[PDB]
């Protein structure tokens, strides 16, 4: 059985390589997984900083136009000076914004 | 004896290591999801935000278009502030769309 | 002890497909971190735009005011008119938002 001897040392080897892939593959798979949170993070904490700032300069503007108003009386009102452009705001959208958020951090 | 021995100890080795190769491709299968679910919520919150700068701008702009109105009498918005004026905001909404376009994307 | 033979022969078709399975992996692996990539770039790129976007809307806003100052001197100004209000500001989180995208772009370097 000579023959057979000799191909069984080839497939312990061989084997051995095996293992030794799937053992890198896990390791690849970790950094993966690593980056993909590290991502997840970056992403998150952006988009909280971008939240904060829109919030801010929504709520800047609204006052604003509040002296706006207040300077148009003596002129008939914000509507008759500028026509119906008046009428449009600035949806506040903070709260889908925040709920996105919160989903993303779910993988912290 | 020894041959017979060899193959046995060879053949759980195998199934093992199948056992590994089908917990592998699950992990994968797994982390293809995730990946999707990043890139989903990414353009979710890239569109609410594209969203409400957008509007922002409009309406700073037609705040603009009052204090020029009120300006006037005055000289203007330019002799009253300055150089400052000519700053505005520049619409940057397609450039916008387009990112978040290419993070929907699949394939 | 012919079937020692085929149990041979068996066990190297497996080694064979298992190979073949783990370059497929290795392939999956790499499309993945290309993915991974691509998002990381194209999350970079719309967070600059809106950082643009943003530190405009603020300046503009912030000469509107000036504007307005200007305009509410004669009833006494911006204070007395609005109350309190007027105090409320836009924070600058430029720098902020500026360091976590740049930490976005140094880990494509790695
Ligand atoms: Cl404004």
């Known amino acids: 059985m000579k023959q057979i001897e ?6 312990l080897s061989k084997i051995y ?10 390791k690849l798979i970790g950094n993966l997984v690593s980056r ?3 991502l997840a993070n970056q992403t998150a904490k952006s988009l909280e900083l971008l939240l904060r700032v829109t919030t801010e300069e929504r709520t800047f503007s609204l006052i604003n136009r509040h002296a706006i ?4 009386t003596r002129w008939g009102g ?3 000076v500028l026509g ?8 506040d959208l903070s709260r889908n ?6 989903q993303i951090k779910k993988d912290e």
């Open 17 to 26: 390589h095996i293992e030794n892939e799937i053992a890198r593959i896990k």
């Open 6 to 11: 000799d191909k069984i040392e080839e497939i």
């Open 78 to 80: 914000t509507c008759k």
């Open 84 to 91: 119906p452009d008046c009428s449009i705001g600035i949806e």
């Open 69 to 72: 108003d207040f300077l148009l």
């Open 97 to 102: 914004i925040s709920e996105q958020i919160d």
């Open 36 to 38: 993909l949170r590290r």
